[PDB]
Design a protein around this ligand. Structure first.
Ligand SMILES: [Ca+2]
Length: 69
Protein backbone atom coordinates (compact mmCIF):
# COMPACT_ATOMS: atom_id res chain seq x y z
CA UNK A 1 0.00 0.00 0.00
CA UNK A 2 2.69 2.65 0.99
CA UNK A 3 5.66 2.47 -1.35
CA UNK A 4 9.06 3.93 -0.71
CA UNK A 5 11.51 4.76 -3.48
CA UNK A 6 14.81 6.49 -3.89
CA UNK A 7 14.84 8.35 -7.17
CA UNK A 8 18.27 9.23 -8.50
CA UNK A 9 18.08 12.63 -10.11
CA UNK A 10 20.51 14.89 -11.88
CA UNK A 11 20.30 18.61 -12.39
CA UNK A 12 19.08 19.85 -9.04
CA UNK A 13 21.61 22.47 -7.96
CA UNK A 14 20.12 25.17 -5.77
CA UNK A 15 18.22 25.38 -2.53
CA UNK A 16 15.41 27.09 -4.33
CA UNK A 17 15.18 24.21 -6.79
CA UNK A 18 15.12 21.75 -3.94
CA UNK A 19 12.42 23.67 -2.13
CA UNK A 20 10.20 23.94 -5.18
CA UNK A 21 10.49 20.29 -6.15
CA UNK A 22 10.02 19.16 -2.59
CA UNK A 23 6.79 21.10 -2.32
CA UNK A 24 5.47 20.03 -5.70
CA UNK A 25 6.13 16.37 -5.06
CA UNK A 26 4.95 16.51 -1.45
CA UNK A 27 1.66 18.10 -2.43
CA UNK A 28 0.74 15.40 -4.86
CA UNK A 29 -2.15 13.45 -3.41
CA UNK A 30 -0.77 10.24 -1.91
CA UNK A 31 2.76 11.53 -1.44
CA UNK A 32 3.63 11.71 2.22
CA UNK A 33 7.32 11.89 3.15
CA UNK A 34 9.74 13.55 0.71
CA UNK A 35 13.44 14.33 1.12
CA UNK A 36 15.81 15.67 -1.46
CA UNK A 37 19.58 15.48 -0.96
CA UNK A 38 21.15 18.26 -2.93
CA UNK A 39 24.62 16.76 -2.93
CA UNK A 40 23.78 13.40 -4.35
CA UNK A 41 20.51 14.12 -6.11
CA UNK A 42 18.57 11.43 -4.29
CA UNK A 43 14.89 12.02 -3.85
CA UNK A 44 13.35 9.71 -1.29
CA UNK A 45 9.61 9.47 -1.37
CA UNK A 46 6.90 7.56 0.49
CA UNK A 47 3.66 7.41 -1.39
CA UNK A 48 0.46 5.57 -2.18
CA UNK A 49 -2.22 5.53 -4.88
CA UNK A 50 -3.14 7.83 -6.52
CA UNK A 51 0.53 8.79 -6.51
CA UNK A 52 2.84 6.44 -8.30
CA UNK A 53 6.45 6.39 -9.34
CA UNK A 54 5.65 7.46 -12.84
CA UNK A 55 3.66 10.54 -11.79
CA UNK A 56 6.40 11.57 -9.30
CA UNK A 57 9.00 11.13 -11.97
CA UNK A 58 6.96 13.14 -14.42
CA UNK A 59 7.04 16.08 -12.00
CA UNK A 60 10.82 15.76 -11.78
CA UNK A 61 11.06 15.86 -15.52
CA UNK A 62 8.55 18.70 -15.82
CA UNK A 63 10.77 20.82 -13.60
CA UNK A 64 13.67 20.22 -15.93
CA UNK A 65 15.65 17.50 -14.19
CA UNK A 66 16.65 13.99 -15.26
CA UNK A 67 16.57 10.62 -13.66
CA UNK A 68 18.88 7.67 -13.75
CA UNK A 69 16.75 4.61 -14.32
CA1 LIG B 1 24.73 22.98 -13.81
Amino acid sequence: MIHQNTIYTAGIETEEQVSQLTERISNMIGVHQVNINIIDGQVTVSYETPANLNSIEKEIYDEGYKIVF
